[PDB]
Design a protein around this motif. Sequence first.
Motif, PDB file in Angstrom:
ATOM      1  N   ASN A   1      68.896  42.505  41.684  1.00  0.00           N
ATOM      2  CA  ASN A   1      67.607  43.398  41.731  1.00  0.00           C
ATOM      3  C   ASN A   1      68.016  44.766  41.486  1.00  0.00           C
ATOM      4  O   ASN A   1      69.179  45.228  41.976  1.00  0.00           O
ATOM      5  CB  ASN A   1      66.951  43.202  42.935  1.00  0.00           C
ATOM      6  CG  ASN A   1      65.369  43.791  42.864  1.00  0.00           C
ATOM      7  OD1 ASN A   1      64.707  44.091  43.742  1.00  0.00           O
ATOM      8  ND2 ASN A   1      65.022  43.859  41.422  1.00  0.00           N
TER       9      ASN A   1
ATOM     10  N   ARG B   1      61.702  40.332  45.121  1.00  0.00           N
ATOM     11  CA  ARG B   1      61.284  40.864  46.159  1.00  0.00           C
ATOM     12  C   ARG B   1      61.442  40.145  47.532  1.00  0.00           C
ATOM     13  O   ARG B   1      61.171  40.466  48.611  1.00  0.00           O
ATOM     14  CB  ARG B   1      59.855  41.155  45.878  1.00  0.00           C
ATOM     15  CG  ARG B   1      59.568  42.281  44.919  1.00  0.00           C
ATOM     16  CD  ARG B   1      58.278  43.029  45.086  1.00  0.00           C
ATOM     17  NE  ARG B   1      57.972  44.149  44.364  1.00  0.00           N
ATOM     18  CZ  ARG B   1      57.808  44.248  42.958  1.00  0.00           C
ATOM     19  NH1 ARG B   1      57.267  43.165  42.647  1.00  0.00           N
ATOM     20  NH2 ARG B   1      57.743  45.433  42.270  1.00  0.00           N
ATOM     21  N   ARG B   2      61.870  38.820  47.313  1.00  0.00           N
ATOM     22  CA  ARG B   2      61.928  38.082  48.728  1.00  0.00           C
ATOM     23  C   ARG B   2      63.453  38.232  49.016  1.00  0.00           C
ATOM     24  O   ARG B   2      64.418  38.363  48.700  1.00  0.00           O
ATOM     25  CB  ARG B   2      61.863  36.546  48.411  1.00  0.00           C
ATOM     26  CG  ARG B   2      60.355  36.123  48.284  1.00  0.00           C
ATOM     27  CD  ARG B   2      60.339  34.552  48.636  1.00  0.00           C
ATOM     28  NE  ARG B   2      59.173  34.136  48.310  1.00  0.00           N
ATOM     29  CZ  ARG B   2      58.612  32.993  48.665  1.00  0.00           C
ATOM     30  NH1 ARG B   2      59.227  32.101  49.546  1.00  0.00           N
ATOM     31  NH2 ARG B   2      57.166  32.458  48.325  1.00  0.00           N
ATOM     32  N   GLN B   3      63.480  38.426  50.524  1.00  0.00           N
ATOM     33  CA  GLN B   3      64.562  38.554  51.475  1.00  0.00           C
ATOM     34  C   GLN B   3      65.479  37.279  51.414  1.00  0.00           C
ATOM     35  O   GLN B   3      65.114  36.439  51.900  1.00  0.00           O
ATOM     36  CB  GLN B   3      64.226  39.118  52.591  1.00  0.00           C
ATOM     37  CG  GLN B   3      63.501  40.445  52.881  1.00  0.00           C
ATOM     38  CD  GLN B   3      63.499  40.615  54.367  1.00  0.00           C
ATOM     39  OE1 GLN B   3      63.403  39.954  55.207  1.00  0.00           O
ATOM     40  NE2 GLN B   3      62.661  41.661  54.443  1.00  0.00           N
ATOM     41  N   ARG B   4      66.617  37.499  50.626  1.00  0.00           N
ATOM     42  CA  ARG B   4      67.770  36.122  50.779  1.00  0.00           C
ATOM     43  C   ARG B   4      69.072  36.543  50.894  1.00  0.00           C
ATOM     44  O   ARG B   4      69.472  37.980  50.847  1.00  0.00           O
ATOM     45  CB  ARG B   4      67.726  35.679  49.175  1.00  0.00           C
ATOM     46  CG  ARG B   4      66.612  34.539  49.227  1.00  0.00           C
ATOM     47  CD  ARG B   4      66.628  33.945  47.575  1.00  0.00           C
ATOM     48  NE  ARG B   4      65.174  33.621  47.295  1.00  0.00           N
ATOM     49  CZ  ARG B   4      64.346  34.240  46.199  1.00  0.00           C
ATOM     50  NH1 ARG B   4      64.764  35.271  45.933  1.00  0.00           N
ATOM     51  NH2 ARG B   4      63.401  33.629  46.248  1.00  0.00           N
TER      52      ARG B   4
ATOM     53  N   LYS C   1      71.353  46.480  43.613  1.00  0.00           N
ATOM     54  CA  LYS C   1      70.654  47.311  44.646  1.00  0.00           C
ATOM     55  C   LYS C   1      71.558  47.705  46.000  1.00  0.00           C
ATOM     56  O   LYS C   1      71.355  48.428  46.628  1.00  0.00           O
ATOM     57  CB  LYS C   1      69.565  46.130  45.259  1.00  0.00           C
ATOM     58  CG  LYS C   1      68.528  46.492  46.280  1.00  0.00           C
ATOM     59  CD  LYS C   1      67.937  45.269  47.035  1.00  0.00           C
ATOM     60  CE  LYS C   1      67.367  45.971  48.367  1.00  0.00           C
ATOM     61  NZ  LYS C   1      66.904  44.807  49.214  1.00  0.00           N
ATOM     62  N   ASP C   2      72.583  46.622  45.884  1.00  0.00           N
ATOM     63  CA  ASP C   2      73.541  47.240  47.161  1.00  0.00           C
ATOM     64  C   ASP C   2      74.340  48.270  46.888  1.00  0.00           C
ATOM     65  O   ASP C   2      74.418  49.346  47.543  1.00  0.00           O
ATOM     66  CB  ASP C   2      74.363  46.011  47.305  1.00  0.00           C
ATOM     67  CG  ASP C   2      73.714  44.592  47.432  1.00  0.00           C
ATOM     68  OD1 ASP C   2      72.744  44.507  48.285  1.00  0.00           O
ATOM     69  OD2 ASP C   2      74.491  43.724  47.031  1.00  0.00           O
TER      70      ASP C   2
END
Lengths: 34, 221, 90, 486, 213, 86
Positions: free
Chosen positions: D338, E62-65, D97-98
């Motif tokens: 992700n 989907r959670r911000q980590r 994703k980055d």
Amino acid sequence: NRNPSARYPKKGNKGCRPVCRAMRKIRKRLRTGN
Amino acid sequence: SQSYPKGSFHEGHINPFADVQWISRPFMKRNMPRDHHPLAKQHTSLKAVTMLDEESGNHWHVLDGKGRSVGGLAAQVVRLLQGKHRVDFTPRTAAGDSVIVVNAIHLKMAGHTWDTKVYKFDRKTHPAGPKIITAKTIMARNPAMILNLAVKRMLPPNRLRPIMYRKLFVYAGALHPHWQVPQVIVPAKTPAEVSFLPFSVERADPVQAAARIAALGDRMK
Amino acid sequence: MWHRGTLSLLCSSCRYVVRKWHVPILGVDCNANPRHKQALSVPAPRSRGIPKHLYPFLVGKQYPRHPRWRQAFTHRSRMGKYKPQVARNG
Amino acid sequence: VGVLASLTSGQMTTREYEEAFLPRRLKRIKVFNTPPPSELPAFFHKRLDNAHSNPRSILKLYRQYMRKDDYPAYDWLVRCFCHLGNVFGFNSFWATKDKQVIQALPSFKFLVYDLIERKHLIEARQVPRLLYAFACLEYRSWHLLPTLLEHVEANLEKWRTPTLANMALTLALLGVGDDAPDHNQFGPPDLLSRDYTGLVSKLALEVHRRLLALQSASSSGPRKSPLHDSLGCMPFDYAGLAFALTLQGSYDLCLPSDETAKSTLALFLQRACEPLSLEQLENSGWVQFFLYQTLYCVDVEKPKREVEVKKAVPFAFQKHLHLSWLDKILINAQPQGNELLQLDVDAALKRLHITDALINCSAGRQWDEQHCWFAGHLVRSRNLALEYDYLLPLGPGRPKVSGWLACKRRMLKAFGLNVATIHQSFWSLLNLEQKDVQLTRLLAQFPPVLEAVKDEKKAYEEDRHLRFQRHARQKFETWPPEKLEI
Amino acid sequence: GVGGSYGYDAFFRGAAEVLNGSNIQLPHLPENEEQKEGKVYQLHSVRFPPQVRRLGANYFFRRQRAVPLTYYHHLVEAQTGRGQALCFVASANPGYLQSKELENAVFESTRGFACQLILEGRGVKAYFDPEWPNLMVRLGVGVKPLALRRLAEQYATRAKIFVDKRGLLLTVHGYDKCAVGTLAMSLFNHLQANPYTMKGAHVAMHPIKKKVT
Amino acid sequence: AGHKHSESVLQQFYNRLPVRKRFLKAIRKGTLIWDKGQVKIPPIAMQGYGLPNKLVLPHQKEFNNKLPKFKGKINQLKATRIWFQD
RNA sequence: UGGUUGAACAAAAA
RNA sequence: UGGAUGCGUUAAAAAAAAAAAAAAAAAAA
RNA sequence: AUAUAACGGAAGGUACGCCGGGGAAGGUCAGAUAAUAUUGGGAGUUCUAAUCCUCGGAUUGUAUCACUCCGGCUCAUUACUCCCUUGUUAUUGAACAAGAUUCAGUUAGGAACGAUAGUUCACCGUCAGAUGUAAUACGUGAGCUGGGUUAAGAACGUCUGGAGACAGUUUGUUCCCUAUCUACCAUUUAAAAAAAAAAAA
RNA sequence: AAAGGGAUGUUUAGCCGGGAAGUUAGCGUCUAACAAAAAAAAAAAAA
RNA sequence: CGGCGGCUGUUGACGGUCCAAAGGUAGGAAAAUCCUUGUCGGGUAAUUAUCGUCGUGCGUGAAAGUUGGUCCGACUCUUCACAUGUCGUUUA
RNA sequence: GAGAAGGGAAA
RNA sequence: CUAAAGAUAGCGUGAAAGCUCAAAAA
RNA sequence: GUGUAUGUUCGAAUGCUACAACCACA
RNA sequence: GGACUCCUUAACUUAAACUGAGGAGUCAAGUAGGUACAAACCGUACAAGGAUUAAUUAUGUCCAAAAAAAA
RNA sequence: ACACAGUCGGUACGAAGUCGACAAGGUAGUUGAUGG
Ligand SMILES: [Zn+2]
């Protein structure tokens, strides 16, 4: 305390009002306490 | 005996170190408005519709209030009601158009306003002072008043304020009842077709597929 | 509950918490001593406050807004009654 | 306590007090005036030499150079791109994703545009760096790729053998130069570039040629380290060459010079395993994954030279890899974090109410105790596997998957699943409703072929008939009460 | 208000009470072992039971980590390691792999959760009148029993209350940790022992302190 | 207001606030504060920890910022003593 | 996060 | 043949209640 | 030489009073002081925080003390979990009963009469078993009284030589106004049932 | 230019203070804070 | 017309000492004098009132008169009785 | 974003 | 297993018993 | 964990009433 | 034998639009603007007179209320 | 009159006709700008 002398100046007064105490009292407290 | 009502901070986390210390809502989580389950996904919002009538000169705006801030919508509505967007604006008449706002139930106020806010209504020479009504109470009884009371006090306090106020129509629900004004919440239309396939497909050999399906069949069931 | 203007951990089992009372309130909970259960509910009244835009005219050395110039400006040559008496060679 | 008694007591003045009696829009005095740089190339080269780790800092350097000059130095642009890729180069802890966020950033696009504008200034000595950066960022640039590939093909006999190996691995990872004809052309349909079929195969054949020439002109010159061979290649280079051959499925490749020619893949495996012991293999890293993947894919697809390819690797090595596969190898080798396209399609599936779609779910043969591949989504009641292609297309409306996903496609075919690939170059053009409609149409072609396994939360079903009448008042039947009703 | 006006303490005193601590009589020692080492982080991986797949992208991706939380599912068909279904959960921060939600996902679908309340005193007994869910508890000889069928109805299908043969242990079991805890704590609130007489219930491993007049 | 002919400026400011009388009572007692149109929990002064920068003088901001910072939640807070900054 | 909630609690988090 | 008042009698329930004085798609009476 | 040392050079009373001119219970301040916690100390068998007393500093605040023409009756309005009544199950040095300290409301119903006394605050007596406190010009005299208190008469003690006087004590001694406006409580046919309303060209 | 009684006329002080007062009155005379083009401390020197 | 003591020893009969013309006597006495409601007693459920009493406190005081007997007053006060709208509290 | 401490209500 | 263990830092008892913390290991 | 219920005070004071010392384990 | 703001002071309870000094600014005897609303603060290229042009003063730029967020 | 009751401004004819009037119309004296 009460409005006629305890009211602070506002932007446009340059920190002074005709019958205000607050500024000078605060300055005196900063200078030599109470 | 009686005690304080349960607010929004009785139903979630509280973080005193954050600016938004707790999430506040017009109602409890179970009481928030929702669409009836079988009657959902049938409508879409254009969010804003304008009707121009050059003969009578009375033009109409129809706005969707779902997800908008009360003050942010009220300022725009006041502009439209005054007519300051028009080149022939005149301060001495209600020179603006007519406005209909829908989905007032879905208006948002940021922060702890839903729990804290109150509204006052003066009572002449009454020893108990003005009648004070809670914002949650107003949201439960008549959501339109939330937008109306902001717009009224954003309008100039001159004698023209009642006229522009009368030219405003707010409704909690999605649809308005005006006979000859278009709706902003309209029936949904099928998505437009496209000329490309977004996916590619490759088929497994039938014999291997049969073997795999047979192997999985007993293991599952 | 011990109603305080300040909260402190009195032993190793004390911890800070938020209570959902009439309003949100800070407090201390303790498994060991019931007397260690505190609520920050009665602090002293908060001060009036000093607006930040008054800082330039409040803090630091302050000098008179209108300078003192007239006395140094005084001179006979600028006075009608006394100019004649002025002598450049006497 | 920083109270500044000098100020607080009334002995000194404050900046705010002084400025309260000045015009609001005077210009602050420049306390220190140092001469500005006359040459930007050296200045920004020094800054880049200082910056290696933060992609934010690298992009800020590029943005400042762009703000100062409209035609920054091309070598500096190449260096900036290489540093940005190395920030994501194959051993980091970043998610994909980055990389997608960096690709989406407008500044990155401006840097790529600047590279394309003067792409004619690329020298032959920078092609491997750009290919490595492309592989690392997973950004396949079809604008620049033809020039780089022309350089690679032109300098075939002049590259260093490890450079050839790394270029082959990077091209295979990007999904370029495979043996499939009419699948390696760049540009829009009306203006198509040259066909680059077999480029990786020619690179491997050049490596084979050099290795055979060693047999005739062997030498005992000093080696860079114990793991380096006469050609300067480490085990990693040979393992990567074998992995690229596996990705393109060129198992039967061999140097045409002789009829009795050993497999090139077998040679690569043998020369990757020669300088390694078992203790060294335990810490080799990517080499373990490459070797085991080669062996597993060879076993799955059963090519003609399967026996020779298997005999290439020591049996002890095979046993160690097999027993340690599930410890760290696969988990450390698979993409981390992700993928945005995966998230979008997962949300679409949830909207469509496909409750048996398993994310990053593996599949294998009926008799394999270990699985070596993971599908983006596995719809297990429909025998379907959804894969995701987030790479750039070869041209407008001409998408193509990477070597990783191509090998996964072949593996899933062998396993017996249907494979549906979503291409982002088309998917991003749609909106929510069109996405839902198209996904429904896709699922219509693979009707439920089995019942879906539920993952229900356990419950005491026997009490389903119990009724909790909240707001049922307490009844005072008798006085005194015999039972304290709640 | 704060952010636009200074308080008297912050203006005149500079907020010195913040640093006027004595530094002795601490309830805890400070953390002196950090040393700002800058240690070598590593990619930790754990092989959770396959039921972790119940927690999908909404939790894992989907959670911000701060750092990525890699998830994969290995679905293959005495223990030997290879040949079983499991979930690879990996990250550079080991704290993620100790989350209680990951274990709750498995326990909800496999075995649930349990708590125990212990009754003591003369004439103190829990029984069924005559069967579940007609739970009754008497807290003495002359004390009328407490009817608790309402809690069983409340938590039907997700929790159950079992009584001992002697009617002195109440075990609350269920398949939702929060619900089980709330049920047990209502039962405890409502059977709590009187510290002067000690007749009543207490949560296991949390005895009530006997008091004396 | 009402039967109180003349009151303090601060008391008048509190009286004019548009909130429920109980939140206003909390504001009067000091357990809540009115700030930029919102009723909030007052900022918390933690012994041994730096205050939020907004509350300190411009010359003291650097020194305050150099102090230790707490970035956890109220449960994790190990500070010996805490109180509302005023 | 749970109508769990008058001065009472459970889950998760860092 | 009756009236008023309490020193007499009854009620102390409803407040979206009892009740009211302006039916209003009528935007230049 | 002289007196001007007040050194530009010494009788008093008026409450019988008169004329001209001018007006001090507030508004403000915050020393004592009031509220809140907090620090130090002293009590509480043991115990700094069940609870009580006191000291310093902090913030907030003005019940008491240091710019006009008293008390009671009648009618009241507002604030403070406030005197009784609420929070099963806060804390308690909480067995129970009777209690103590706070905190909390969608603020709900209520807290009787007298002797001496001009009194307020109080003391004493009865009933009850529910000290309430403060503000509203120490609410309210164009709504009432006029006991105290501050004019003319007169007396006692005391001070002066006296007329006279006393923040000493007493007895007697005209308490006005037909409501214009604001406020409030009552109150009110309507389009018409007075008169008039005469166009178009 | 004497004494006593009665009438007539005039006066019976400044400043601080309700007032009584206390103290005080010509001349001389002790107690003083304002800032850095008061610091080579924007300016100078050197280069 | 006017005036009619002070500091001390033995509660001090009785002395010392200073001053003076004399040092306020008899008799009233918490008073129209003194005073927030002095002690004791009667009246009351409760007595800052009133009467009597003490001579405790402040004191007064002898034709600028002291203390009393009877009767008197559109005088200032205490108490008992009466039918009582003065009152709880108002109505016809 | 501030005695924004005239009213509304905004990031 | 190694190594560490305050004439004791927080509880607890009429006094004892008992738990934790400090230290070391992991 | 262990000399140790260290010494004095105390009817006692066993790490934990209060003072002294605060040593000691291949 | 004036008022208020500012600087420096004596007296005051380091109180008061308190009292009393030394200097500047306004008011007094100076409009129209800002500072919410009846002198003393800010600002003025200060008001002879007329007019439907223009200017960065203080100070503003979500609405009451004039004034920025193309693709 | 909201108004120490004043002051500065303050409605912009006809087509209300009709035997009307560049590129398209599907003939309305109607229409041209606008896909994620
Ligand atoms: Zn504790």
